[PDB]
Amino acid sequence: HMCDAFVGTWKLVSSENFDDYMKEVGVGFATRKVAGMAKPNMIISVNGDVITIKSESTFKNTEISFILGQEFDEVTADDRKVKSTITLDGGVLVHVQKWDGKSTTIKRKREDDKLVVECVMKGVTSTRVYERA
Ligand SMILES: O=C(Nc1ccc(F)c(Cl)c1)[C@H]1CCCC[C@H]1C(=O)O
Incomplete structure (x- = not known):
């Protein structure tokens, strides 16, 4: 019941300062422009201890599955190969x-x-706000 309030299908309704964030991350011009236009659907589900977060958009579809506190490999939508760790901190x-x-x-x-x-x-x-789809 850890992430119950996150579970569901969410749609992007606002984005602020995302281009600047992507610049700082090192995303190049063409990816920034196309990625910044995207209005992704975020789909969050839980099955036992495994959390899955999918993003579906016209630019890229991504999916990560993970257990809290357990590092994993992730290829981001901008094609970085990163080592990720996700935890719950005070409900975040x-x-x-x-x-x-x-x-x-x-x-x-x-x-x-x-x-x-x-x-x-x-x-x-950057701040990105989603509402229920
Ligand atoms: O944006 C994301 N993923 C994502 C996936 C597929 C895409 F095509 C594009 Cl453009 C973005 C998340 C990861 C980076 C910060 C904002 C997060 C979010 O908003 O859900």
């Missing part, structure tokens, strides 16, 4: 990605009827 899913001596942290939280995603790469934060 905290996802850290490590690659090439760099790190970014993505937090996913339930706030009212929204799922709020905050992405940080050094000093730069």
Whole structure:
């Protein structure tokens, strides 16, 4: 029942500062433009201890499955090969990605009827807001 409030199908309704976040991450121009246009569906499900997060969009479809606290390999939508660890901290899913001596942290939280995603790469934060589909 750990992530019950996250489970479901969510649609992107707002994005702020995503281009700047992607710049800081090292995403090149053409990927930034196309990825920044995407309006993904996020699908979160749980089966036992395994959490699955899918993103479906016109740009890329991605899927990760993981157990909290247990590192895994992830190929991101922008084609980074990262080492990821996701934990629950005070009801917030905290996802850290490590690659090439760099790190970014993505937090996913339930706030009212929204799922709020905050992405940080050094000093730069982007906020992406999802509602139920
Ligand atoms: O955006 C994401 N994934 C994702 C997948 C497939 C795509 F095509 C595009 Cl563009 C993005 C997540 C990962 C990076 C930070 C924001 C997160 C989110 O909003 O759900």
